[PDB]
Amino acid sequence: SIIIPGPNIVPGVNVNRKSKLGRSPAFGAFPVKKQPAVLTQKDDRLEDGIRLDDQLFLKHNKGDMDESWPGLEAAADLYFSKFPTMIHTLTMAAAINGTPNLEGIDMNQAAGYPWNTMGRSRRSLFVQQNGIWLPLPELEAEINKTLEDPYYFYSTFLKDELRPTSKVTLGLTRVVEAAPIHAIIAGRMLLGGLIEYMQANPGKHGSAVGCNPDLHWTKFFFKFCHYPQVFDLDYKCFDATLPSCAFRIVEKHLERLIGDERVTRYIETIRHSRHVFGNETYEMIGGNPSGCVGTSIINTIINNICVLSALIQHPDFSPESFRILAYGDDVIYGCDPPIHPSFIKEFYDRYTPLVVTPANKTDTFPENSTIYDVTFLKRWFVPDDIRPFYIHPVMDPDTYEQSVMWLRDGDFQDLVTSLCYLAFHSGPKTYDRWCTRVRDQVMKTTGFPPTFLPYSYLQTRWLNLLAA
């Protein structure tokens, strides 16, 4: 991306500087590998020589690419050829209240700039009236204004989350960019029919967006197991390296499919975004500001175009003999005959700003990889022991082991119950170890262990949801 600093604005946006995370009663149940990210310069855990706000944008300002590399326009034509030839828009009412395959506006999220500086919550900008949300006139005016002549600021916040301890001391905390509510609804009107269509069939068009891993892991597994090899393709700084040339190609195709000229100038505000960080402002040329389900769809589409542009360079590529599955920067793919990830890294290094690296941190990719080796959405594909035709999404243990040791504003028992749905896919023995180790630590702290959903209950509910 390219960062262009702009003038300061008054009033600015109040940046979060106080974490809601704190140690849970289960703290110490597992070895401590993570701590909450540093949110303020005065945090004592920060290494003495480091400026926190400088660390937030290290991936950015490395450059932007405006010209297409070879195969990019051809790969996009191939990818979009499978789409319906007329994608519909959504009405403002459907964009606010949602559809069966698009969720309604979440009224508890912040409204973004400039509503936050005006003290106006998302809920204050709408009226609920027979169970249906309607915009207030001041917000309806900004929506129509954004559709016709978009101009709005993303709000930059610090991500309040657990980080590996070395990232805490180095101040390598991540940024969240919240789109304003009027820009979100306008984008849902222009792109919500595309989002509706894609989310209704997860795994189609190389996109897992909108999937439910408990149900769709079995579907994804059998669409990939027929390929002898399936590979991870991990990126470095994918959000920062997204080039303008990819955005312009997606604009041309989405405007053609949707048949509305306004989608190009809306997506142009994503490709060339404006941001407010406290009292400071800046422009980001290239790169992905996130903050939207539509940007997740756009990022996933751009990832499919970029991987396909490398795949078509291989002599053995066939249109009928490849499959990609992506969610933003997270990708797995397979081809018959196989096309090795090193072939993609070679093409990426020569023609593109994309940076792919092996998952193992090695200087080279694994020589062979199957559906059983890949990681997708932080989960492995593991067939059930008793019913091998059902596939478990097995989450990385460090996620729920570290997460149970920290708590936010919610009740601790509610956090434990929500983690049980993730942990139990590891199997009855690994699940019982996790429950037992949490129980022992909470017993030392409060003397009264929390309750855990039995493995037989979670497994029965999982099988019934797959057998329906």
Q: Give the resolution to one decimal, in Å.
A: 2.6
What are 116's two structure tokens? 């936050």
Helices (H), 3-109: 52-55, 72-80, 92-97
User: What is the C-alpha to C-alpha distance for residues 277 and 9, in angstroms, rounded to an integer?
Assistant: 10
235 within 8 A of 327, measured Cβ to Cβ: no
Pairing of strands 126-129, 132-135: antiparallel
Q: Which residue has the tokens 């964009």?
A: 95
Q: What are phi and psi of 269, to 5 degrees?
A: -75, -15
224 within 8 A of 230, measured Cβ to Cβ: yes
Neighbours of 201 (CB within 10 A): 13
Q: Which residue has the tokens 């828009």?
A: 89
Q: Which residue has the tokens 């119950």?
A: 417
Residues 6+ apart with CB under 8 A from 414: none
Strands (E), 236-278: 272-277
CA atoms within 13 A on the CB side of 21: 18
User: What is the C-alpha to C-alpha distance for residues 372 and 362, in angstroms, rounded to an integer?
Assistant: 20
Neighbours of 97 (CB within 10 A): 16
The residue extents of the domains of the chain are: 1-202+243-294, 203-242+295-395, 396-468
User: What is the C-alpha to C-alpha distance for residues 390 and 383, in angstroms, rounded to an integer?
Assistant: 6
User: What is the C-alpha to C-alpha distance for residues 380 and 199, in angstroms, rounded to an integer?
Assistant: 22
Per-residue burial over 397-411, b if 16 or more Cβ lie within 10 Å, else e, is eebbbbbbbbbeeee
User: What is the C-alpha to C-alpha distance for residues 356 and 463, in angstroms, rounded to an integer?
Assistant: 37
Give the H or E element holding residue 402.
helix 397-403
- Sequence-distant contacts of 387-392: CB under 8 A, at least 24 apart: 387/463, 389/218, 390/218, 390/462, 390/463, 390/466, 391/217, 391/218, 391/220, 391/221, 391/222, 392/217, 392/425, 392/426
Strands (E), 179-306: 231-232, 234-235, 272-277, 280-285
Tell me how far apart the terminal alpha carbons of the chain are, to the nearest angstrom: 46
- Sequence-distant contacts of 354-360: CB under 8 A, at least 24 apart: 354/235, 354/238, 354/241, 354/306, 355/235, 355/236, 355/237, 355/241, 356/233, 356/234, 356/235, 356/236, 357/234, 357/235, 357/236, 358/234, 359/232, 359/234
Q: How far is CA 204 from CA 199, 290, 304, 389, in A?
A: 9, 22, 11, 21
Residues 6+ apart with CB under 8 A from 323: 206, 223, 224, 227, 333, 334, 335
426 within 8 A of 420, measured Cβ to Cβ: no
Superfamily (CATH H level) for 203-242+295-395: Reverse transcriptase/Diguanylate cyclase domain (3.30.70.270)
Residues 6+ apart with CB under 8 A from 324: 206, 303, 304, 307, 308, 331, 332, 333
Angle, nearest 10°, between helix axes 428-445 and 455-467? 140
User: What is the C-alpha to C-alpha distance for residues 17 and 36, in angstroms, rounded to an integer?
Assistant: 12
Residues 6+ apart with CB under 8 A from 371: 221, 224, 225, 227, 230, 334, 381
